[PDB]
Design a binder for this molecule. Structure first.
Ligand SMILES: Nc1ncnc2c1ncn2[C@@H]1O[C@H](COP(=O)(O)OP(=O)(O)NP(=O)(O)O)[C@@H](O)[C@H]1O
Ligand SMILES: [Mn+2]
Lengths: 343, 159
């Protein structure tokens, strides 16, 4: 079995031709603010927040990420911002969250994503303590296939962590937050991500590639299976010291194959890290730990999730913590409009 | 085992990719004071991994910051993009926060802060008012990143 169960060469050929196409030709102002009821703030970011919303005329719920152009501009992370929109609206994958439309006004940038009432894997992982290798592996096979997808288009997600992983109505992952998603020809530099997930090549300004997403994979699988992240401490600097040192310990319950597959994923020498060798992602699909995985089924979502969140009906905002609702008003004066003309 | 949990935010530095020109062609060594940095840095992360080449070019990148007294080098809340180092003088530490705003430390002709702004921008963790007159050493994040990045792009990799 392994990487020979599913034949994916022709698929990634069309997928690439379909992505180059949508990327070069987006869509602008496909909606309006005054068309959505700001139900509740699902999550707060750095430049804004994602609020649950309901279209007045459709009565439909969506997740709305809001971004303060000025702040974006203020912080100079204006490029990723545009990339997040354009790249997201350009991809299609079973485990990739979908965008419905977008638009802008005098103060903000609006991205309207489908709503995933399931919540962040983080909410459940933290509540359930830690998952069984089976359960953890189930989510992993999904990232491995999305990373394969995304990377073949020459894209780097750059931000894997439980927090950005939505569990939908069937128990499947919906990757959200394309804030660091960038297209890469050979390598990139921007130091970015989430502390406990940053690879050693990013922390030290060493130029990196699609191999930092694979490193994040080894961390994710770890935190899912162990309960806590492999590298943790009070000071993030205390975290970066450890990531760099690279030394890690494994829960005594961690099976022997999980320990083998993480030693190759959390490999400091990127010319030795799994997913970045000659056979690429296949080494991962043929690792002993992924011995019981049915890739074709996994892809078609034809496998019963080991866990499905409690789901009531339309608008259920319980799987999500609560957040300080802080009203948002547009403006009579446009700010930094020429610096977002693409949106 | 372990602990310390709670939803984690995303860190992000400014966008950057060299490939441009590389013009250019160094502050006053102060020599005696020089040893102070090369010693107060042998503990810093982004410094410990550096090459002597990168180290050298890095010491000079740091400018000289002056402050009399009742002065505030770093206000708790500020974005800040500079890494500082006490050279002379005395400074107190007001962790002004939690609800109130007490005091919590004393820096004196030793001790450095802001190591976390050399990587990306982030909220200053505490106000550091000067009990000086004293002289500090600062280093811009940008000034720093360019030094390291420009140097690492030259390195040949295995594709
Ligand atoms: N499609 C979605 N459906 C439901 N909830 C969502 C969706 N997209 C985002 N969220 C939630 O909103 C939170 C914040 O969105 P996010 O895009 O991650 O903010 P951010 O600006 O990227 N901040 P950060 O994640 O730290 O970089 C997420 O962690 C989810 O809980
Ligand atoms: Mn983000």
């Amino acid at each position: 079995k392994g990487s020979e169960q599913e034949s994916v060469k022709e698929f990634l050929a069309k997928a690439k031709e379909d992505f180059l196409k949508k990327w070069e030709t987006p869509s602008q102002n496909t909606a309006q603010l005054d068309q959505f009821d700001r139900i509740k703030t699902l999550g707060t970011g750095s430049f804004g927040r994602v609020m649950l919303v309901k279209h007045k005329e459709s009565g439909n719920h969506y997740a709305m990420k809001i971004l303060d152009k000025q702040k974006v501009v203020k912080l100079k992370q204006i490029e990723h911002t545009l990339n997040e929109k354009r790249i997201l609206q350009a991809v299609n994958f079973p485990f990739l969250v979908k965008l419905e439309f977008s638009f802008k006004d005098n103060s903000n940038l609006y991205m309207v994503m489908e709503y995933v009432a399931g919540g962040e894997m983080f909410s459940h992982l933290r509540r359930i303590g830690r998952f069984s290798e089976p359960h953890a592996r189930f989510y992993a096979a999904q990232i491995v296939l999305t990373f394969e997808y995304l990377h073949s288009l020459d894209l780097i997600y750059r931000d894997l962590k439980p927090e950005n992983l939505l569990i939908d109505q069937q128990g499947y992952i919906q990757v959200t937050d394309f804030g660091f998603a960038k297209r890469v020809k050979g390598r990139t530099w921007t130091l970015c991500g989430t502390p406990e997930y940053l690879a050693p090549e990013i922390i030290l300004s060493k130029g990196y590639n699609k191999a930092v997403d694979w490193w994040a994979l080894g961390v994710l699988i770890y935190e899912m299976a162990a309960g806590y992240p492999p590298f943790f401490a009070d000071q993030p600097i205390q975290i970066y010291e450890k990531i760099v040192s690279g030394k890690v310990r494994f829960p005594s319950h961690f099976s022997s194959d999980l320990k083998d597959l993480l030693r190759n994923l959390l490999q400091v020498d990127l010319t030795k890290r799994f997913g970045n060798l000659k056979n690429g992602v296949n080494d991962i699909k043929n690792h002993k730990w992924f011995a019981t995985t049915d890739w074709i089924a996994i892809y078609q979502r034809k496998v019963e999730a080991p866990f499905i969140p409690k789901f009531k009906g339309p608008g259920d905002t319980s799987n999500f913590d609560d957040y300080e609702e802080e009203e948002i008003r547009v403006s009579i004066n446009e700010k930094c409009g020429k610096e977002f003309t693409e949106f | 085992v372990i602990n310390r949990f709670t939803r984690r935010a995303s860190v992000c530095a400014e966008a950057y990719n060299p490939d441009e020109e590389e013009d250019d062609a160094i502050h006053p060594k102060t020599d005696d004071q020089r040893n102070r940095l090369q010693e107060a840095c042998k503990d810093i992360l982004l410094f410990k991994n550096l090459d002597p080449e990168q180290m050298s070019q890095v010491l000079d990148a740091m400018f000289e910051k002056l402050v009399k007294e009742g002065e505030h080098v770093i206000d708790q809340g500020d974005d800040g993009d500079n890494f500082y180092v006490i050279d002379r003088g005395t400074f107190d530490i007001y962790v002004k926060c939690d609800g109130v705003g007490r005091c919590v430390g004393n820096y004196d002709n030793r001790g450095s802060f802001g190591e976390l702004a050399l990587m990306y921008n982030t909220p200053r963790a505490a106000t550091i008012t000067a009990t000086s007159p004293g002289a500090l050493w600062g280093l811009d994040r940008v000034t720093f990143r360019r030094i390291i990045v420009k140097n690492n792009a030259k390195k040949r990799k295995m594709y």
